[PDB]
Design a protein around this ligand. Structure first.
Ligand SMILES: [Cu+2]
Ligand SMILES: [Cu+2]
Ligand SMILES: [Cu+2]
Ligand SMILES: [Cu+2]
Ligand SMILES: [Cu+2]
Ligand SMILES: [Cu+2]
Ligand SMILES: [Cu+2]
Ligand SMILES: [Cu+2]
Ligand SMILES: [Cu+2]
Ligand SMILES: [Cu+2]
Ligand SMILES: [Cu+2]
Ligand SMILES: [Cu+2]
Ligand SMILES: [O-]
Ligand SMILES: [O-]
Ligand SMILES: [O-]
Lengths: 278, 278, 278
C-alpha cells in the first residue's frame, strides 16, 4: 500500500473545547471561543491514544459532553445521573481513552476502539440532551487503527431530525472534490427520525471502514444505508472513480424527506475546475 | 461447486426499455411497448459488462431511469438537474457500466459492481421521482461476480410504501417452488416507510449474496431484515430445506403493516405438486 | 481459548410451555403454570439439538408458538392458516430442529442454525399475533454453535412498542454485574416502531455473536444498533472492561423514545458491591 496510512497510537493528547450559544439560537461546540461549528470540530485519534478534553460550558444552562465508542470512566460519560455534566460557566475535564485489539487472558479477542464515532450533549433540554442535540451540540469522532488508509479530506454529514447539519432545507451542505481525491465521509444521525443515506455515482463497503480489505472481505457493498438516531458510520470513496466528474446528489432516500429538502451535492470537479452540466 | 455459477463478464449489452402509463393509473417499465410490468423487468449482468439502454418515454410527462450501484456517467444519472431525464415521447440512451474488483495503483482494493441493485424513476411527481416510484417505475438489477452461484429462479419483492409490488393489500404476490429448488429473492424497499422483511421457515446470510462463502464467513444469519426506502438486498434459499413443503408466509413483520396487508405466500410444493395444508 | 465454550449438539430435548393470562391483563409464556414471565423463559440449545415443546394454552383465546430462525415443519409454524395454533385449553406439541453448517452435494455451504432468535405468538389479537405480542407472548431463543464462548449470565431486553419488556416507562429493567463478568445480552424488538439500542461504556461486534473471531473479522464494532419489529440480535461484553464500574445507562437512542422512558441501567459493581456514583 503506497497510500498514506495511520500510525500506531498511544499518545496523550490534550484539547480545549467549549459549548457556546450561537447568535441564531443554536448551540455548538468549538475548540476556540467564538469559533463554534455545527457539526462541532472533528476529533481524530489513533487506537491507543488518550484524550484529555478540558470542556468549558459558556452557556447559561447545564450542558455535557458524551462520546460513543471510546473508553471512558463513568466520571466522563457526561450524564446528569452520574454527576458528570457541567454547570453554566463551569469547566470540567473529560477523559476518553482508546485501545487496540488483542487477546485477553481467557484466549478471547478484545475489539479495539477503531471506528466512526461521535460526541453530543446529554443534558440540555432533557436528561438525554434532546435540546442540545437539536440545537447542534454534536460532532464526529474518528478512531484510526494502525494501518487504516488516510483520506485527502473528511466531511461530516449529520442527519439531525429533518436537516443536514442543522441547515435550512434545500441548502446543502455541498462538498467539492476533484476526480480521484480520496474523500472520507462521516455520517451521523441524530434526533427522532429514521433515514436512508444515498450517494449518486459512488458506493462503499458496509463495514467498519467502508473499504474492503481485499478479495476475501465478505462485506456487502452499498450506496444506500439505513440509519437511525446516534448511528454513525464512515467510508472513503475515490471521487468520480469510474463515473467521472459531475454534480453528484446525496440525500436521504426517504421520498418525503428528500422532497422536504434533505439534499446536498458532491461536486466532483474536472482537473480544470469544471463540473459537467451543473 | 457442481452448481451453476456466473461467468466472467465483459460483454457489451443493448436493451430497449419503455416507460408507459398503464390503463389503471400506474406507470411501469417494460422491454416491449405494451408489455410493461410493476416491478419492471429484471436486468441481470456480469461484472465488467456494459449495458446500453435505449430508453423511450411513452408518457405525457417527463420521466427518467436512475440506477443504483452500477457505474454511470453524470449524463446517465437520470436527474432533471443534470439534463438527464427524458421528455414525453423522447428517447435517450442511458449507459450503465460495471467493473470487477482489483488492486488500485496505491495498493488499496477497489470494490466491484457486484450486488443486488435497482433502477427507478427520478423526475415523475417530484425532482426525486416520488410520483414515478409511487406509480411503479422501479425494477431490480442484479450484477453477478465471476463464480456467484446461479439460482433456479429469481423473484422480486418490493415494499413500495404500504404495498408489495404495488398490489392491493392482502393479495400477495405469492410464489411457487418445489422443495429443493434454488430460489433467489431480490428485495427492494421504496417510498417513505421502514419495514422488516420476514420469511417463515427460511433464512439467509446478511451479506452481499445472502450466502456464506463457507466456514469462515462471519456474516450473521437472519430471517428478518430491516429495510428503508431505496434499500436493496438479495439472497438465495433452498426451498423447504430442512423444513419440507408448505405455504410459508413472508411479510413485513411490522405488526401494523402485516395487519394492514403486507403478506405473501412462498408456496413450496412436494414433487406431486401438493402443499401440506393450504 | 480457556473460557467455557459450547459443546457439539445433537440431543433430543423436551419441554413443557404454557400460555397464561396474567392477573394484570398481560399474557405470558412459562415453563410451569403460574410461573410465566414477560419476556418468556429463555430456550437455549446447541446446533443439532432437537426440541419438543409440549405447549398448552391455558387462556380463553386461541394462541400459538411461532419461532424464528430454527428449523420447523409447517405443522409447527404456529399460524392459524397452517392449522397450527392451539385452541383454548388445548395442548399441541411443537417441534423445532436445528442443524450445523456444512457442505451440500452441489458444494455450496449450508448455513447453521446458530443465532440469537426468538419465539412469539401468532394468533392472539390478529392473524399475526399483534395482540399476543403486545401482551407479552414473546421470549428469546439462543442456538449455540460448537465452540461459541459461553457467558457468565444472559439478560433479555425487548423493545416492545414504547416499552422495555412490557414495563411501565422509566422503570428499567435494570441489571447488575460485577466488573469483569462476561454478560450476554439478547436484544429483541417487537411491535410497530423502529428503535436504536444504545449502551453506555460498552461496545460489541455487529455480527452473529457480537464477538470478533480474531484479528481478521471485518465486522463493524458498534454501540448503537438500529432494530425493527421481530429483529433479534445478541452480544457479549466484559462488564466495565476498560471503563470500570458505574451505573451504565442503556436506552433507545431515539430522542423522543428515551425521553418518553425507554431507559434502563446496567449496574456494574466493584467487588465491594459499590457502584461509583449511584
Ligand atoms: Cu445516553
Ligand atoms: Cu430521511
Ligand atoms: Cu441514486
Ligand atoms: Cu449518544
Ligand atoms: Cu437520488
Ligand atoms: Cu412494513
Ligand atoms: Cu417467523
Ligand atoms: Cu435511488
Ligand atoms: Cu409471520
Ligand atoms: Cu425507540
Ligand atoms: Cu452513549
Ligand atoms: Cu415473527
Ligand atoms: O435516487
Ligand atoms: O412471524
Ligand atoms: O447517549
Amino acid at each position: 500500500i503506497t497510500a498514506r496510512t495511520a500510525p500506531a497510537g498511544g499518545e496523550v493528547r490534550h484539547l480545549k473545547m467549549y459549548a457556546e450559544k450561537l447568535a441564531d439560537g443554536q448551540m455548538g461546540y468549538g475548540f476556540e471561543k467564538g469559533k463554534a461549528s455545527v457539526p462541532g470540530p472533528l476529533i481524530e485519534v489513533n487506537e491507543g491514544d488518550t484524550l484529555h478534553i478540558e470542556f468549558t460550558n459558556t452557556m447559561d444552562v447545564r450542558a455535557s459532553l458524551h462520546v460513543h465508542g471510546l473508553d471512558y470512566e463513568i466520571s466522563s460519560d457526561g450524564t446528569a445521573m452520574n454527576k458528570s455534566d457541567v454547570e453554566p460557566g463551569g469547566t470540567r475535564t473529560y477523559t476518553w481513552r482508546t485501545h487496540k485489539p488483542g487477546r485477553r487472558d481467557d484466549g478471547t479477542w478484545r475489539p479495539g476502539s477503531a471506528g466512526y464515532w461521535h460526541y453530543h450533549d446529554h443534558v440540555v433540554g432533557t436528561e438525554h440532551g434532546t435540546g442540545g442535540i437539536r440545537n447542534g451540540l454534536y460532532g464526529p469522532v474518528i478512531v484510526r487503527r494502525k494501518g487504516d488508509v488516510l483520506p485527502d479530506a473528511t466531511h461530516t454529514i449529520v442527519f439531525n431530525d429533518m436537516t443536514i447539519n442543522n441547515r435550512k432545507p434545500h441548502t446543502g451542505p455541498d462538498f467539492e472534490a476533484t476526480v480521484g481525491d480520496r474523500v472520507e465521509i462521516v455520517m451521523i444521525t441524530h434526533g427522532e427520525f429514521y433515514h436512508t443515506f444515498h450517494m449518486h455515482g459512488h458506493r462503499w463497503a458496509d463495514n467498519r471502514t467502508g473499504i474492503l480489505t481485499g478479495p476475501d472481505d465478505p462485506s456487502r457493498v452499498i450506496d444506500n444505508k439505513i440509519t437511525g438516531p446516534a448511528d454513525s458510520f464512515g467510508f472513503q470513496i475515490i471521487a468520480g472513480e469510474g463515473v467521472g466528474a459531475g454534480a453528484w446528489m446525496y440525500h436521504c432516500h426517504n421520498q418525503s424527506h428528500s422532497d422536504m429538502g434533505m439534499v446536498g451535492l458532491f461536486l466532483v470537479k474536472k482537473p480544470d475546475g469544471t463540473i459537467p452540466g451543473y
